[PDB]
Structures are given as C-alpha cells and as structure tokens.
Structure 1
Amino acid sequence: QVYMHRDMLPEPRLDDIERFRQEGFYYTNMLEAPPEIDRVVQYTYEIARL
C-alpha cells in the first residue's frame, strides 16, 4: 500500500513560543486510512509502456 500524491509540508505559526513548544508538533507520511477507491488510478507495466 504505497501511494504517490502531492502534499505540502506544514508551516505552523509561532504566535506564542512556549505555547507552541508545549504541544508535541510532528509530521509524518504514514496514512491513517487508504484513500477512497474512486480517487486512485492504478498503473501496471503495460499501461505505462503504451
């Protein structure tokens, strides 16, 4: 279950420094659930070759 998709790295705003530091902000590319079935396009070798 490996997918290719265009996404943006988060850019949080540091309006309050210690308030932001208190929450453990982090980012990952791990997915909570696979995408909806009708939003994906499946390639094989044959389609790419054509």
Structure 2
Amino acid sequence: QVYMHRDMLPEPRLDDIERFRQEGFYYTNMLEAPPEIDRVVQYTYEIARL
C-alpha cells in the first residue's frame, strides 16, 4: 500500500510560542486509511510501456 500523491508540508502559525510548544506538533507521511478506490489510478508495466 504505497501511493504517489502531491501534498504539502504544514506551515503552522506561531502567534503564541509557549502554547505551540506545549502541544507536540509533528508531521508524518503515514496514512490513517487508504484513499477511496474511485480516486486511485492503477498502473502496471504494460500500460506504462504503451
């Protein structure tokens, strides 16, 4: 279950430094659930070669 998809690195605001520090902000590329099957395009070697 490996997918290619264009996404963006988060850019959170720093209006209050200490409150932002108190929450453990982090980013990951791990998915909570696979995407909907109707928005996935399936590629194979034959189609890529064609």
Give TM-score scaled by structure 2 length: 0.99
Deviations 1:12-43 (A, max 9, x none): 00000000000000000000000000000000
Taking the aligned partners of 1:43 and 1:20, their CA distance within structure 2 comes to: 42
Q: Which runs of 5+ in 2 are unaligned?
A: none
Whole-Å separation in 2 of the counterparts to 1:48 and 1:3: 16
**Aligned residue pair count:** 50
Structure 1 portions without partners, runs of 5+: none
Equivalent in the alignment of 1:9: 9
Shift of 1:5: 0.1
| C-alpha RMSD of the superposition | 0.2
Identity score, percent: 100
